[PDB]
Amino acid sequence: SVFSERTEESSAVQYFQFYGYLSQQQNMMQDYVRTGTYQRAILQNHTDFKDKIVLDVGCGSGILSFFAAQAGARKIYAVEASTMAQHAEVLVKSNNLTDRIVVIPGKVEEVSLPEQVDIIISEPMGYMLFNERMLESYLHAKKYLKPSGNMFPTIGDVHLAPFTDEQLYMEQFTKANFWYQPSFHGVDLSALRGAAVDEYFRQPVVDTFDIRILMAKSVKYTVNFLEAKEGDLHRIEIPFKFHMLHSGLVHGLAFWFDVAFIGSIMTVWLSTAPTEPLTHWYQVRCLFQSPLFAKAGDTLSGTCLLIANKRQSYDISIVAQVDQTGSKSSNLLDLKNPFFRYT
Amino acid sequence: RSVFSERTEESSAVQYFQFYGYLSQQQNMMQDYVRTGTYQRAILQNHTDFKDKIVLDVGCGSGILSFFAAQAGARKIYAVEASTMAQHAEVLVKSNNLTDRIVVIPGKVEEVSLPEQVDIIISEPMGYMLFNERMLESYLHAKKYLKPSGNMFPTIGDVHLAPFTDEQLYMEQFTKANFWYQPSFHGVDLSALRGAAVDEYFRQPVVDTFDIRILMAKSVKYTVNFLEAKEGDLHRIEIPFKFHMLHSGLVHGLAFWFDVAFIGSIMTVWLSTAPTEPLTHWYQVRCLFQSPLFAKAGDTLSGTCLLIANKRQSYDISIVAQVDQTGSKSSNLLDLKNPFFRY
Amino acid sequence: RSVFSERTEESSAVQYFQFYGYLSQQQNMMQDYVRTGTYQRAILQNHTDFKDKIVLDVGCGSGILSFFAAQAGARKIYAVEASTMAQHAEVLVKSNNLTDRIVVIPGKVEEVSLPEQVDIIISEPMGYMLFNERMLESYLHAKKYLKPSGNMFPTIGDVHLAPFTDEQLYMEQFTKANFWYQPSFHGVDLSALRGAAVDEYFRQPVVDTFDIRILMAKSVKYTVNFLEAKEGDLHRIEIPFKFHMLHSGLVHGLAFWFDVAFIGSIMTVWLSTAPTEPLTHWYQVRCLFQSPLFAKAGDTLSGTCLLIANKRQSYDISIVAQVDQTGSKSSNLLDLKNPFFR
Amino acid sequence: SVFSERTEESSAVQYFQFYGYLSQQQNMMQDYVRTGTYQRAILQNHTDFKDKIVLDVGCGSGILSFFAAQAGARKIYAVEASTMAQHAEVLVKSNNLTDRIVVIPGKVEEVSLPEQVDIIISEPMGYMLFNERMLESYLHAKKYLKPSGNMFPTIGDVHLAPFTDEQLYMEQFTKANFWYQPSFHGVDLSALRGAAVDEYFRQPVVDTFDIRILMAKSVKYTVNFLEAKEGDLHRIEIPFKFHMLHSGLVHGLAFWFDVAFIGSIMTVWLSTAPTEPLTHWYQVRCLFQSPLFAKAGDTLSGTCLLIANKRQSYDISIVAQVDQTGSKSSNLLDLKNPFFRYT
Ligand SMILES: COCn1cc(C[NH2+]CC[C@H]2O[C@@H](n3cnc4c(N)ncnc43)[C@H](O)[C@@H]2O)c(N)nc1=O
Ligand SMILES: COCn1cc(C[NH2+]CC[C@H]2O[C@@H](n3cnc4c(N)ncnc43)[C@H](O)[C@@H]2O)c(N)nc1=O
Ligand SMILES: COCn1cc(C[NH2+]CC[C@H]2O[C@@H](n3cnc4c(N)ncnc43)[C@H](O)[C@@H]2O)c(N)nc1=O
Ligand SMILES: COCn1cc(C[NH2+]CC[C@H]2O[C@@H](n3cnc4c(N)ncnc43)[C@H](O)[C@@H]2O)c(N)nc1=O
């Protein structure tokens, strides 16, 4: 199957074991902006669901399918690969919707659907949008979509912006300098200091921050789910050229994302920006190995390259330079194992 | 066929050794001064057990215990580690000018080949509730390389269990499960999953610390002698208990902690994780009853704690407890692999 | 045969009037200075509404309100009381030398005979959640003796309901019901009765007081005009509500309290049992949801509170409420006859 | 029916409405001494239940019948007049004992039983034992008992003792003096002071106390349930002659009770004495209208006459005199409406 060939067994096992916990479902269900916005997006666009055939990709407990039912859907095929699929089956029955919702346990790449659908609903977003590589499953599911179909969400916007956070930057060396001592219980640990530093900077930082740390207007990269193919997400190149609004040291790039549900009646947005109420996605920051100095009016240019790996994630390569001075910095990060810093 | 792989699911082992490949993880355990200091004390104060001896370090990580053995005057130390950390151990050996005495051997101890038999095996195989991670079996497996008169550091392990009362913790866990009682979460009836939820939450052992005044009886001790035990002895561990209740009230579950002893030629050194001792990264472990049992002082609380090893490098825990004077019985099942870190 | 007996089970009435025959009970309400003081204030500052007038005191008890009417210059007061306390009131009338102005008439106001029509009716018919005990119907029934332009003290009653958050109270009641979850109480499996246990406990309205900070929205008010209302109006009371949520969080239920107003010729006097005011023996009443509803600020909480009068001199309470923006719905049933005094 | 003939309907309505609440059942079940002692008496006398026919009078939720089943009874007829009977039926079903326990809704005086039983079990005790008049139902049930049959409990002892409590006595007047003021909001309430005093002294006081207020060894009155007829409890004359242990003012009499389960293997006692842990029966105190002075060595004599009324309770008439001085005092009380003073 498409899924198995692009995914290490070991990763998938852990992955779907994670999503088999009800506390996990509960965690996201209790994120009100997420759940409420989805419900709002579906119900306020009822003409996109009334008497329609629906596919729910990765339905979990099946909540989104129930929203599709509330909107008047004729038939909803709810696909889920984790064991949560049982619990969804329980809920459909207990809610007297066995006639409209069909839970189909398995990976969307492997199961079979009896008919084509009018619309696909899903929540494939991970950290920095792309983490978990579910965007690909969502796009893969379009093999079941009628030429007349819609996708909820319809587009996804990733935003990148340079930031200054002197403390976050110095934090890494404060932690790594543990190894910079010539006699830890009689052992000289110093030789590992460099490797320790390396390890810390490879982790993207998951948390939130004050918007005043942002030093330039964000650059946006858009995925149109109606148009994009799976292969388009194996290699994602985000070129950028930031026009610096403030003077100071740029310590790295901040990431967040929005999705839009473009329905027949209205467009509804779900935003994870630092200007909006906090979600379980938070924001993601990737540090530069060396900060770059820039003055207001200077230009910070370069590329963010995301290469997909078989651990259901991406290798992040970021290169940036201040055009006016020629000061250059790089970093390589492993998105699969971020550092949860939020307190 | 390797012993390790035969008892271990691939997916679990990958994750397992990925976790221990991070330097931050090493730092975290190294910074536990009680642990590190006590190990160094046990080794250095029993230096005659190491002088001009052959040593095996099982799961050496960064290699600190091997360095303690080197400080103690060991003639040759074979330091085995299956994670990538082994590369970092090699660096320290070189930078500390101990290349002639410490030899890092990458791989699983069940799979590597050792050049000679050793005089003593040192290790830190203890996990949560002592038995989590199933490394005790690797530690015991390694005895195939031990001379007939050889020693084990640690030499024995004592598991302690005692009933406790903690209304807050219980209500804390029940409150989480009460989410699934809702008959109309965004219009969806979740109640049918309420039973499954409470099951899931009470399935998690609670890792943290507590005040000793919550203990309602003298602890019961279960001892594993590492010099004598076989791997097979740890596939099914049955711990019978009979507590004489010192206080009246609700027993909400059983608390677990452990001690290990380094029985050397000069002296015996103890490492304790009891709640009467300073806190370690092992903390203490509590298994909640789904239903608390009322008992008065002078009553007897009897039953068994049964540990069945699984292929995820952990144990399925079954606890049965009864108030003998009334016949009030409680039964519970816990998954030790996935505890709730409450601290 | 009488209106009272037809709407009341004998057993309930017996127990009911047995309760009000104790002097300690009388003392208990008289010692509520806010209550008694406000009544005297309402009557005395509106002395012109009593000056040389004919008065009916419905359920006079010890006869205190009648004495206030006497102090205000009333010509003649008919004091009706169905319990045995009526004997004690007559003693006080005699010992206070007011035999010429206060006439005690033993019996139910639905059954006794009055010699003449009155200019004003005084009473204290309020119970828990205002309506408990169903005496308002007796109070309204008594208007058959009121001259056309006559007055009522109190003149109106306002019931207030507001959503609240109180997790501790909720888990307090939830902790109690889980007793019945035990699969081995002395070796006995009680779990099969859990559902019934939760039902029983959450059916009880909670009588006590609380900090006003637990209220999540401005209260909604339901008004009874005693000058206009009929008995029948209180057999089935439907109270619609739409709360505009001021805070985000869990709504654990609805809190109820009431005010009455004495609208006299000189001034209007209010008696309040709100949580912003000093505590009275009416306290406040809260009806819990079996499961709380989450709402964030700006949302709207809508639904209905339905009160059905029963033959035990009380009400069957039905509360249905929903968060409009999300469709989170709750339905609940409470038995006002069986409150929980915490 | 016998029950209807001795009971006013309104009282019966109130009475069985009280016992229809699960919270009420729960409250007695949560009395560990009560429930545990019943269980102990039944289980340690298992030979009195093994393969026997049992009658459970007023079974409530059915707890004692389940105990009888645990002891090995062949058949248990469980009679209950309140609606709780339905709940008992539920538990019988869920505990898979439908073949051994038969719930019979109704009053034991009115229902039909198919056969004679070997033993009757019940908990008919009220305040000072006799309140609620259920002992008569218990004795009435012996029409279904085989000769040589047994009763659990087998006997009941009511204990009386003189007490001194100056505060309790003066309390009545502190409360009644509310009415002794010439201008309560302009009203002279004084004329009702006497009636208020009368009212307070008619109520027996339910609460507990320090045993040090007791001025003599109690006098005991025994009901042997094996020998007694119900009619024996319509008029209960309890003569008393106390040998005063302490000097002082006697303000009244204190009441409590014990029951004994005299089985073939052993006798088990349930005590509500003030020297034992507190139960939901507490203790009962009846005040003299005027205190009597007594010296150590004096004798306090008289009678406590209990006259049963149709409100399922008793009018208590107490007369007492100090023999050596001839100082005499009496009181008449209404046991149906006691004053709960306990804090
Ligand atoms: C915010 O951090 C990440 N994150 C993301 C989300 C949103 N992603 C739900 C995916 C849900 O979809 C399921 N899923 C993923 N790949 C799937 C596939 N090929 N076939 C079928 N179901 C699949 C998966 O089991 C889970 O139930 C969330 N609900 N919680 C989170 O913690
Ligand atoms: C729950 O906390 C307990 N805990 C315990 C310890 C002590 N446990 C060392 C295992 C170390 O031993 C290694 N290891 C495990 N099984 C092994 C095996 N067959 N062969 C070789 N090395 C092995 C593994 O890679 C790790 O480096 C720790 N260093 N951190 C902790 O967090
Ligand atoms: C605090 O909440 C309960 N509560 C209420 C009140 C206020 N309710 C006075 C009724 C008083 O009026 C009497 N009463 C009730 N229905 C009556 C009727 N058809 N005809 C004549 N008298 C009646 C009844 O006997 C009592 O004396 C209070 N005085 N104490 C309380 O404890
Ligand atoms: C603390 O003192 C009061 N008290 C006493 C007791 C002990 N008395 C049980 C009576 C139980 O027996 C029942 N009962 C009484 N007369 C009955 C009758 N002719 N026929 C059948 N059942 C009858 C009654 O419905 C209740 O289930 C208790 N279980 N709770 C209390 O609160």
User: Number of helix segments of chain A?
Assistant: 9
**Overall geometric form of chain A:** globular
**Could you say how many structural domains of chain A there are in total?**
2
Would you give the CATH topology of the largest domain in chain A? Hnrnp arginine n-methyltransferase1
Distance between the termini of chain A: 40 Å
Compounds present?
A: ligand LHD
SS elements, strand count of chain A? 16
What's the name of the CATH homologous superfamily of the largest domain in chain A? Hnrnp arginine n-methyltransferase1
Structure description:
- Chain B: It comes from Mus musculus.
- Chain B: Its EC number is 2.1.1.319.
- Chain B: The modification Phosphoserine is found at residue 83.
- 4 copies of one chain form a homotetramer.
- By secondary structure, chain A is of the alpha/beta class.
- The first copy, chain A, has 2 domains: 1-153, 3-Layer(aba) Sandwich (Rossmann fold); 155-343, Hnrnp arginine n-methyltransferase1, CATH 2.70.160.
- Chain A has helices at 2-5, 9-18, 22-29, 32-43, 63-70, 84-94, 135-140, 166-176, 193-201, and strands spanning 53-57, 75-80, 101-105, 117-122, 145-152, 155-163, 205-207, 219-224, 235-243, 248-262, 267-271, 283-294, 299-309, 313-322, 327-334, 339-340.
- In chain A, strands 6, 7, 8, 10, 11, 12 and 16 form a 7-stranded mixed β-sheet that branches.
- In chain A, helix 4 packs parallel to helix 5 and helix 8 (166-176) runs antiparallel to helix 9 (193-201).
- The first copy, chain A, is globular.
- The two termini of chain A are 40 Å apart.
- The interface between B and C is medium-sized, with 17 and 20 residues.
- The complex binds ligand LHD (4 copies).
- One ligand LHD binds next to strand 2 of chain D.
